[PDB]
């Protein structure tokens, strides 16, 4: 690995500089190098890893959607034949996106998840695993699609089981996991009623626990609750 010669602390430092410069590909490469040092990640380091890859894959997903829409219009009746270029370029972007997802999943499997014993780290990584299988599922069209969807579901479900046992209903990791699992149900699993039920239950249980929080924790939790509310407004 090209980061093998750089100190762990220097990789972390540079990941933070890359974030400030909005150089998210660099950020992700620095954080991959830090993970590959083999030590567990702190809370702040886990969130650097997540931010970096979320931004990289977010740009790829947005580009893939643009190209997929153009390709679908090319296959309408009355559309002029333009050759293989749209499909080829959509496939190029798709393959890169799949490569980034495989990279993240590989870091989680070797060996972030197996070393994560505290609920806050284990739930975080299992949520990531569900997310990156979900991004694979967004572009999947073949004979492994059902298994990719089930891999996302299984990771989210394990994270949910731990989070419900070990975290309060207002914990931001628990809330963000429930938010993303509800999106999985709505957008991937063709289960809009499950998505709505999960979002509503998550919101209501967090509401009832806000009274226990400091002002700063209240701000953290209500920000994610608003995303659940935004989705419920979209979906109902």
């Amino acid at each position: 690995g090209a980061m093998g010669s750089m100190e762990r602390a220097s990789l972390i430092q540079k990941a933070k500089l890359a974030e400030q410069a909005e150089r998210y590909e660099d950020m992700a490469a620095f954080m991959k190098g830090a993970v590959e040092k083999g030590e567990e990640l702190s809370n702040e380091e886990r969130n650097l890893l997540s931010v970096a890859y979320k931004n990289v894959v977010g740009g790829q997903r947005a580009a893939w959607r643009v190209l997929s829409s153009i390709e679908q219009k090319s296959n309408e009746e009355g559309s002029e034949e333009k050759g293989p270029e749209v499909r080829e370029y959509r496939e190029k972007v798709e393959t890169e996106l799949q490569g980034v997802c495989d990279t993240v999943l590989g870091l989680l499997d070797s060996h972030l998840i197996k070393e994560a014993g505290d609920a806050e780290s284990r739930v975080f990584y299992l949520k990531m695993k569900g997310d990156y299988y979900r991004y694979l599922a967004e572009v999947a069209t073949g004979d492994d699609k059902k298994r990719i969807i089930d891999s996302a579901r299984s990771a989210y479900q394990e994270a949910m089981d731990i989070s419900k046992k070990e975290m309060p209903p207002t914990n931001p990791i628990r809330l963000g996991l429930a938010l993303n699992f509800s999106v999985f149900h709505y957008e991937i699993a063709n289960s809009p009623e499950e998505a709505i039920s999960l979002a509503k239950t998550t919101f209501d249980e967090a509401m009832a626990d806000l009274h226990t929080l400091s002002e700063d924790s209240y701000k953290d939790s209500t920000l994610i609750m608003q995303l659940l509310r935004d989705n419920l407004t979209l979906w109902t």
């Binding site: 997310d131 996991l177 938010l179 993303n180 509800s182 957008e187 995303l227």
Partner: peptide, 6 residues
């Protein structure tokens, strides 16, 4: 697109 965690 529904909002996922930011």
């Amino acid at each position: 697109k529904a909002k996922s965690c930011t």
